[PDB]
Design a protein around this ligand. Structure first.
Ligand SMILES: [Cl-]
Ligand code: NA
Ligand code: NA
Ligand SMILES: [Zn+2]
Ligand SMILES: [Zn+2]
Ligand SMILES: [Zn+2]
Ligand SMILES: [Zn+2]
Ligand SMILES: [Zn+2]
Ligand SMILES: [Zn+2]
Lengths: 325, 325
């Protein structure tokens, strides 16, 4: 109970202490888990704490060694309910480089990653061998978090009972057991930009963008996006739709995973609504930039827009087929 | 889960919300109680929150028809473990006015109030009718919190499992179901002075002293004591051993409740160690002052010192006898 006492007194844990905190949490009674999650949330987190917890979560996870891979994710929470751009970006990115998309840590999955992918015809539960098969021949696989993180099984009831944002919203994206070399990570508030960028440094990522787009855990196609770039230290800069070569446009809402799937598929096949296409493309651009496929965000968008068409729809068919074979 | 969300976001609850929080806590699973206790501890408390919780706890408690009564108590969890002066003060105060001493909710119960009283020969669990019998004929009774607060039955396991200070350490002294008109309340840090004084205002106390004696939840017989006096608004002042008419003396540690009982009994009978006698007497003085029995702290000590002797030991015999009859 000394770690709890440390947290309640307003003291930030070390990396090593946060690592041991995860391991205490996975074998604790619900009462103590609840106390820890609530207390840590009230205090707020540093990058060392996030990194420690994330490292522990990865170490406890079902083992998989795909290549050097990229991943795109968000903390979620957010507020508004738009289409799942991190899924579309990950699919578009697989046209250029190896992608291992880590699944939704949160239960609130309306227009959510696993759900959109199921609706697009994938089997979302894939063994580590099947995952490797999928990355070798299609450059895409999906890592479904409940399947790959058995240590969370006792944590999940406690997260439902509490019904608040916890640290598990934030470390979900940082706990991909494939150890992605490249990451785009969206955060729901500007206050998570610094901790999350720092945590990705501790986790030894090659290149990463931590993004916040004016109230969204995504790159905005309308107003400005705050970016922290991790790689040669940490670099802060601001983007706008002009930087991707598009006219500002407001993304429009989404009702259900089936609506999400159809709109994404429309965009992936070279068609779809402008507000969906440009929103997906600015997020795809960031992912191509983070992966080192594109030199800048304008080129990232150019390349992603050109990947859209019949070839992307047959790529999606082959991913689906291969997930169920 | 909106009250938890409110707390985790750094918002102070209102009196009314803290009142409803108590009632939610008494019918909740341990997981949610843990989350609440830890989160509220990490945020800190205002006087409205303490008062709300304390008011709710009193309202849920087994009812009592004692007189206008006085009480003396501490939050506990101070620096370390000296003898239980709040028990001795309460006993000495019963020579002059009606006293209903509220029992330790607290886990720091080595040399703790119920334990010291058990060691002095009392049955510490008394029915409300027996409590009234004891106040009518001896001016003293002891209200054992676990017996009088059935709402704590789910709360107490959660407090043991967590093993940190919670809000229940602070509201225990504020939750005497007899509704004492007069109170001395010791606090373990200067930061609790203002909240606790404010909470006693909300709880409609006639006169109260909230005291902190240089690292102790008691009036110090060595160094200075910070006092907040509640009555005609709130008055701040500092006391020293000179104000009671004694030479400074260091209170010395205690190993067990049986040692605590013997040292107290020695002092109560007119004898005992100087360091124990003067420490008990400065705390008794404050209680006589809070009760309006004494005009100032010097007179409070004079009166308390003169009450010590054979009459006090036979008073204690009759309290013990009457608690077990
Ligand atoms: Cl698995
Ligand atoms: Na396996
Ligand atoms: Na003296
Ligand atoms: Zn989102
Ligand atoms: Zn640059
Ligand atoms: Zn206040
Ligand atoms: Zn106030
Ligand atoms: Zn007993
Ligand atoms: Zn004490």
């Amino acid at each position: 109970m000394s770690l709890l006492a440390k947290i309640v007194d307003g003291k930030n844990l070390s990396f090593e202490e946060a690592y041991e905190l995860f391991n205490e949490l996975k074998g604790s009674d619900g009462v103590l888990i609840g106390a820890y999650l609530a207390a840590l949330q009230t205090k707020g987190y540093t990058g060392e704490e996030l990194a420690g917890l994330a490292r522990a979560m990865r170490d406890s996870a079902v083992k998989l060694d795909l290549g050097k891979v990229a991943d795109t994710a968000g903390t979620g929470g957010d507020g508004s309910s738009t289409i799942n751009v991190s899924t579309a970006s990950a699919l578009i990115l697989s046209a250029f480089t190896r992608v291992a998309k880590h699944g939704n840590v949160s239960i609130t999955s309306k227009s959510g990653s696993a759900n959109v992918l199921e609706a697009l015809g994938l089997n979302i539960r894939v063994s580590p061998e099947r995952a490797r098969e999928m990355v070798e021949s299609t450059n895409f696989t999906f890592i479904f978090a409940p399947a790959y993180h058995p240590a969370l099984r006792p944590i999940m009831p406690v997260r439902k009972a509490l019904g608040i944002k916890t640290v598990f919203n934030v470390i979900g994206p940082l706990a991909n057991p494939a150890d992605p070399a490249y990451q785009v990570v969206g955060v729901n508030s500007p206050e998570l930009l610094e901790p999350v960028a720092e945590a990705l440094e501790f986790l030894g990522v090659e290149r990463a963008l931590v993004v916040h787009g004016s109230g969204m855990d995504e790159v905005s196609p309308h107003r400005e996006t705050l970016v922290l770039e991790v790689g040669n230290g940490v670099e802060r800069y601001t983007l706008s739709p002009e930087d991707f070569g598009i006219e500002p446009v407001k993304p429009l809402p989404c009702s259900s995973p089936e609506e999400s799937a159809a709109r994404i598929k429309a965009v992936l096949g070279g068609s779809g609504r402008r507000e969906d296409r440009d929103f997906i493309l600015v997020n795809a651009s960031a992912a191509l930039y983070a992966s080192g496929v594109a030199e800048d965000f304008r080129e990232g968008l150019e390349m992603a827009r050109e990947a859209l068409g019949q070839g992307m729809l047959e790529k999606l068919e082959e991913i689906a087929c291969l997930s169920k074979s």
